[PDB]
Each structure stands twice: as C-alpha cells, then as structure tokens.
Amino acid sequence: RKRPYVAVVGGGIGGLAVALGLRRQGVEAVVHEQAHALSHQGAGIAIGANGHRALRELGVAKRLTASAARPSRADFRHWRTGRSMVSHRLTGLYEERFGAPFWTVERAAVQQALLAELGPRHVRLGARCTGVDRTADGAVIRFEDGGEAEADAVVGADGIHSAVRHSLFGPQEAVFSGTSGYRALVPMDRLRHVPELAEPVLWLWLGPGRHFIAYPVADGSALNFLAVVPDGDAAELRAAFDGWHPFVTEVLGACERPGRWALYDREPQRVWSSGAVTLLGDAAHAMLPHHGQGANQALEDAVVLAHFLARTDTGGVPSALRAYERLRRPRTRLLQAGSRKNAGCFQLPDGPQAEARNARLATLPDDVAWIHGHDILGSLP
Ligand SMILES: Cc1cc2nc3c(=O)[nH]c(=O)nc-3n(C[C@H](O)[C@H](O)[C@H](O)COP(=O)(O)OP(=O)(O)OC[C@H]3O[C@@H](n4cnc5c(N)ncnc54)[C@H](O)[C@@H]3O)c2cc1C
Ligand SMILES: [Cl-]
C-alpha cells in the first residue's frame, strides 16, 4: 500500500506549512511556486494563540521568537480624540487564558522560518500552475511553460485567485469590499516624535468610513500599519484620514511609498475537494483582513490536512481530503462572516451604534475565545 506523493501548488504560508507538516509526518511533499524567488515584502501580520500552536506543532515557533514582537495590550482608540475607548491587557492574561502568546511579526519572517525548516530543495521556483486534471489514481498539474507533474494528491494553496480552484469548480468572481488596504513597515527611528509608540501596543483606531491598525514587528524596531479606506499615492491616503488624531497622521506621514491592496474575499464554498485534489488557505476560504486570522487559518488548515494525509494510503486520499474539509469548513465560514461584520463595525460614525459596538468590545476576550482559544490538535479524531 503506497503512501501518497503530494504536490502542493503555492509557496505562501499555507503551502509551505502543509508541505512542512506532511514531511514531518513522513509524507513526501513538494511545493510548486510561480515566483522566481520569495519576496521579503508584505509587511505585518498578527499571530493568535491558535496560530502560535500550529507553528509549535510544525516546529517553527522557536525560530520566530527573535523577530516576533509582544504587544502589551489591544487598544481601541477614538479616531478624533485619541481616547482609549476599550483596552485589554495581553501581557500574561492572553497566554494564561488561551495557551500561547499573541505575537506580531513580518509575513516574510514567518514565510522564511517555514521555508528553512522545510528545506528550500523541496520548493520548485518558477512553476506557475495553469490547471489540474484528475486522473484515475490521482491528479496532474499543468504549468505555463508546458510542464506537468503527476501526484497522488494535489493541494491548492495558490491564494485567493487559485488556478487550482478555477480548474475544479469553474470561474468564480472574488467579492470586492469597496475598500483598499494601505500597508507599510515604518522604521521606528522615523517615529521618535510619536510618544505613544514607547509601549508596544496593538492599535485599532476606529472612525467613520475607514479604520487604521498599527503594531510593532521586528522586535519593536519597525511599526506595521494597515489603513482601510473607501476606494498607491501617499497623498490620497493621508487625505482620507483628514481630521484624525495626530498619531494616525504622523504615522501615515512617515512613509512616502505605502502599498495599496484592493480588499477582496469570497463567499463560503460548500465544496473544496474533488477526488485527489483539495484547497487550502486563501484558495479555500478567503476572508477580509479584519480578524487578523487568514494566515492563522492557513496554519490550522496545514496541521489538519497533514494529519489526515499522513494516515492513509493512495486509495484513501479522497476520503482524507473530505475529512479535512468537513472539519475545517464550518470554522472558516464563521471567520469569513465575522471579518465582514467587523469591516462595518470598525467604520461606524459616532452615535448609538458605535457606543453599542464599544460595549460588546468590553467582553471581547469571551466573545472571541472560540477563535484564539481553539486547540487545533484537540479538534482531530
Ligand atoms: C492587509 C492584510 C492584512 C492581513 N493581516 C493578517 C493578520 O494580521 N493575521 C493573519 O493571520 N492574516 C492576515 N492576513 C491574511 C494573510 O496574509 C493570508 O490569509 C495568508 O497569507 C494566506 O496565505 P496563503 O498561503 O493561503 O496564500 P498566499 O499568501 O496568497 O500565497 C499563495 C502563493 O501561491 C503562489 N501562487 C499563486 N498562484 C499560483 C499559481 N497558479 N501557480 C503557482 N504558484 C502560485 C503565490 O505566488 C504565493 O506564493 C492579512 C491580509 C491582508 C490582505
Ligand atoms: Cl486576515
């Protein structure tokens, strides 16, 4: 009984993590990534306890300790007055409650740590997938350059515009939010004038029509920011935050060339898997960035999918892909819905609804425990 050889399309967090996770449990997995080399851009992400646990399982948490940063609190700030509307301490309480720390870190750092632990030799650069056809015993991936690679299982981790998803279920439009995210890492030495940044904090500035998130990365030496605005040029971004507190305007004014990303997600899908092909990460369940969980969820996907594929033979692959999907879909669906809800919530004008939002924010540790406190390993059979 042959154990499956596994081809993974995409070398982002999701693809690296699942390849790394498969190999750690004795399955041969190989990544096909379209880019000629992996980027060192892409700014900051937040790793919750739930994702931290996935990184421990995959053996990469120890390598990320240095470049991680440990926000002491989540501080929800009024757009105009700069007052702390709601605050929750993370130092100690977060780890005690949910079983692991809250980290903020560069995307690229997480990507690099995964790449190293997996081994770069397991990643084919320059391989752009254009398609996947199911065979009788497995599947074969088509590349742009005419190539092919057959396998006992194929995992589509090729992002929100997944070639693998298109092949399996046909054309499907990504859903535009009507907002853009501007993202940047600002060196802290360009922000000496901003005294709030003396403490490491997860900042969430909430206001009318738009919002602004900031946090430290690289052990406190740079500050990530994400500015979500109705929909790139720095002048138009600075203007969209006219009237806001100096903290926001000063941080925006310290980056000449921020990155702009139209923010899309997709409707939840009833089906991810077809014979020996399945999806993972943004390809399976793309969400807006408003829970800070997309990477976290790709990591959960990776752990769970590696578990099922490490325990089967070639003939058990379809069943294993369906078991992964059946466990992962409901959770990701709720996060998708939640991330949409939060886009609205973060952008209310001043008024009763915003005051009611603020009230429900007081009970946030209970209300999001299902996310941060989730034990991925304990969810398995
Ligand atoms: C502004 C913003 C802020 C965010 N903040 C957070 C946060 O705080 N916390 C969090 O957990 N998540 C966050 N996310 C979400 C997170 O970045 C993603 O969910 C996560 O990186 C998705 O990883 P992935 O591997 O599924 O996909 P991607 O990172 O999209 O990787 C896909 C890979 O596949 C490759 N590829 C694509 N098509 C092909 C092809 N046809 N053939 C071969 N290779 C291909 C790409 O080159 C890429 O390397 C944020 C997202 C945004 C937009
Ligand atoms: Cl996200």
Numbering used by the authors: 3 to 233, 245 to 394
Which statements did the authors publish about this structure?
Here, we elucidate the biosynthesis of the antibiotic 3,7-dihydroxytropolone in Actinobacteria by in vitro pathway reconstitution using paa catabolic enzymes as well as dedicated downstream tailoring enzymes, including a thioesterase (TrlF) and two flavoprotein monooxygenases (TrlCD and TrlE). We furthermore mechanistically and structurally characterize the multifunctional key enzyme TrlE, which mediates an unanticipated ipso-substitution involving a hydroxylation and subsequent decarboxylation of the CoA-freed side chain, followed by ring oxidation to afford tropolone. Based on sequence comparison and phylogenetic analysis, TrlE belongs to the group A FPMOs that typically feature a mobile flavin cofactor with distinctive “OUT” and “IN” conformations, enabling flavin reduction (in the presence of the native substrate) and substrate hydroxylation, respectively. While the biosynthesis of unmodified 4 from 3 in Gram-negative bacteria has been recently linked to the action of the non-canonical flavoprotein dioxygenase TdaE that structurally resembles acyl-CoA dehydrogenases, herein we describe a structurally and functionally unrelated group A FPMO TrlE from Gram-positive Actinobacteria with GR-2 type Rossmann fold as key enzyme for 4 formation.
To gain more insights into the underlying catalytic mechanism of TrlE, further mechanistic and structural investigation was conducted starting with protein crystallization. Following extensive screening, yellow TrlE crystals indicative of bound FAD could be obtained that diffracted up to 2.5 Å. The structure was solved via molecular replacement and showed that TrlE features the typical glutathione reductase (GR-2) type Rossmann fold of group A FPMOs with two distinct domains I and II involved in FAD and substrate binding, respectively. The non-covalently bound FAD observed in this structure is present in the “IN” conformation, in which the isoalloxazine moiety faces the proposed substrate binding site. Interestingly, the active site of TrlE with residues R185, Y217 and H213 most closely resembles TropB, 3HB6H and NicC (rather than SalH/NahG), implying similar mechanisms for substrate binding and activation in these enzymes. While TrlE readily crystallized with bound FAD, no complex structure with the substrate could be obtained. Flexible molecular docking of 7 into the obtained crystal structure of TrIE was conducted. Compound 7 is ring hydroxylated at C1, which is located approximately 5.6 Å from the flavin C4α and thus fully in line with typical substrate orientations in FPMOs that employ the canonical flavin-C4α-(hydro)peroxide for catalysis. In the case of TrlE, this hydroxyl group of 7 points upwards towards the re-side of the FAD-C4α, adjacent to a loop with the sequence motif PHH.
